[PDB]
Design a protein around this ligand. Structure first.
Ligand SMILES: CNc1cc(-c2ccc3[nH]ccc3c2)nc(S(C)(=O)=O)n1
Length: 108
């Protein structure tokens, strides 16, 4: 696959900022607070959140788009596994993942 260029990285920053600004993004902005879900980190093996992804973008951690998409998909998969399908948290993953897909297609 094609390495992420400096120009690609500016696009990833734009995509990440779009997700961080979405009104349904709140549960994903930062790592789950263990005090608000004391079982969360025993349930979810590989936590992920948008602030961790922002740190990784700023550090040029990602070499291929597939790696960035994989971290984003972890956010949504973790949410749907931890929460029941009628939870407001689950709803956020449904909305934000479709929004991410729209933005990802534009990024290409
Ligand atoms: C009750 N279920 C939950 C609770 C939370 C949660 C709680 C407190 C929090 N403080 C800072 C982030 C943060 C996230 N996040 C989810 S999530 C990421 O959508 O799977 N599900």
């Amino acid at each position: 696959l094609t390495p992420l260029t400096e120009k690609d990285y500016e696009g990833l920053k734009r995509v990440l900022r779009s997700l961080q600004a979405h009104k349904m993004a709140w549960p994903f902005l930062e790592p789950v607070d263990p005090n608000d879900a004391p079982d969360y980190y025993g349930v979810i093996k590989e936590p992920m959140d948008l602030a961790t992804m922002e740190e990784r973008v700023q550090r040029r951690y990602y070499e291929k788009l597939t790696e960035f998409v994989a971290d984003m998909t972890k956010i949504f998969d973790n949410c749907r596994y931890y929460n029941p399908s009628d939870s407001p948290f689950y709803q956020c993953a449904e909305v934000l993942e479709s929004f991410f897909v729209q933005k990802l297609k534009g990024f290409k």
